[PDB]
Design a protein around this ligand. Structure first.
Ligand SMILES: CC(C)c1nc(CN(C)C(=O)N[C@H](C(=O)N[C@@H](Cc2ccccc2)C[C@H](O)[C@H](Cc2ccccc2)NC(=O)OCc2cncs2)C(C)C)cs1
Length: 325
């Protein structure tokens, strides 16, 4: 069982350190259940985001083996291109040998320049991995470095320490009640069916069901822009001068919980979860249109995951949820 501590950066990004190569070169990576590639910046990249983050240097690793396979990824925010290569990755106390990973060669755009983390470690299914690169957790399972084909995620609140990815384990110290298991609707993302979104008894979105993914790499609770717009009004949010959804800090005490029904079980989010507070109070919701085969995706990001300990089970292709302790 491997324990990977995560730093909680402003309740918006959760990243942990990994080592790559021999000797180990260290990187912070987002542990991202919404993607499936591992990549870090490399010395081959001249982009500005590469210049203000750690860069992997193959020349200094005795176990590195190059490939001539290239890689390209577009995320909802930014993007990268690079090279695949093989090396030993240290993650959660586990020596993940012969792990294929991306060495960036371009990292355009503002966001990655200002992000505190170097790269991304995806935890989703191999079917959505760019250039078919074996995801890290698949490589762990295939080498037998975890005994149970599952991992769990605890994300702390209020910028506290203690966030953790548990590789190969479930820890009931981190939740209360029993774990509720949700079948994966479509194996790619950790994609599940959301039955309803309600408020004060009344359905306010996702009437008749909608597809959703559980995504540690997304800060907010996002959905189709239209549906999100109604929710933004139902809680009393509106764009400011400079483009942010302001909610009175007065309403954290007044409004009722918003309830997500998943596989017939109710998962409430209180105003203290879906209203981001700092004097300054913003909406935890944000519009973002994610079109796919199965339909337009909702994103249950860190706003939701902070309230529910989450188990990602590849043995039986299910997601487990329980209220955090
Ligand atoms: C400044 C402060 C307030 C904030 N920082 C943030 C951090 N941001 C921007 C995000 O969380 N933004 C999310 C995001 O892209 N998360 C990303 C991590 C990331 C962050 C920054 C730069 C590069 C990558 C990672 C997320 O798991 C997204 C979720 C997703 C899935 C499918 C389609 C679209 C989106 N995953 C992907 O984009 O997967 C890439 C793929 C494309 N094809 C197959 S997988 C968006 C979905 C909104 C939010 S608020």
């Amino acid at each position: 069982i491997g324990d990977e501590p995560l730093e909680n950066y402003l309740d918006t990004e959760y990243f942990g350190t990994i080592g790559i190569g021999t000797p180990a070169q260290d990187f912070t990576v987002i542990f991202d259940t919404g993607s499936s590639n591992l990549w870090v910046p490399s010395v081959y990249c001249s982009s500005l985001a590469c210049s203000d983050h750690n860069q992997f240097n193959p020349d200094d690793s005795s176990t590195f083996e190059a490939t001539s396979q290239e890689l390209s990824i577009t995320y909802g925010t930014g993007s990268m291109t690079g090279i695949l290569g093989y090396d030993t990755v240290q993650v959660g106390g586990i020596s993940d040998t012969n792990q294929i990973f991306g060495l960036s060669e371009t990292e355009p755009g503002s966001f990655l320049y200002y992000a505190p983390f170097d790269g991304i470690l995806g935890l989703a299914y191999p079917s959505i991995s760019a250039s078919g690169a074996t995801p890290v957790f698949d490589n762990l399972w295939d080498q037998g470095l975890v005994s149970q084909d599952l991992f769990s995620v605890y994300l702390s609140s209020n910028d506290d320490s203690g966030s953790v990815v548990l590789l190969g384990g479930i820890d009931s110290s981190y939740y209360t009640g029993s774990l509720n298991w949700v079948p994966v609707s479509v194996e790619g993302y950790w994609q599940i069916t959301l039955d309803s979104i309600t408020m004060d008894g009344e359905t306010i979105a996702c009437s008749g069901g909608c597809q959703a993914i559980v995504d540690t790499g997304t800060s907010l609770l996002t959905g189709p822009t239209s549906a999100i717009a109604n929710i933004q009004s139902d809680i009393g949010a509106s764009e400011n001068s400079d483009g942010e959804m302001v909610i009175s800090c007065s309403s954290i005490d007044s409004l009722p919980d918003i309830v997500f029904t998943i596989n017939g079980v109710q998962y409430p989010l209180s105003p203290s979860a879906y209203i981001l507070q700092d004097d300054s109070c913003t909406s935890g919701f944000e519009g973002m249109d994610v079109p796919t085969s199965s339909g337009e995706l909702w994103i249950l990001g860190d706003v939701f995951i902070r309230q529910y300990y989450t188990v990602f089970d590849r043995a039986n292709n299910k997601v487990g949820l329980a209220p955090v302790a």
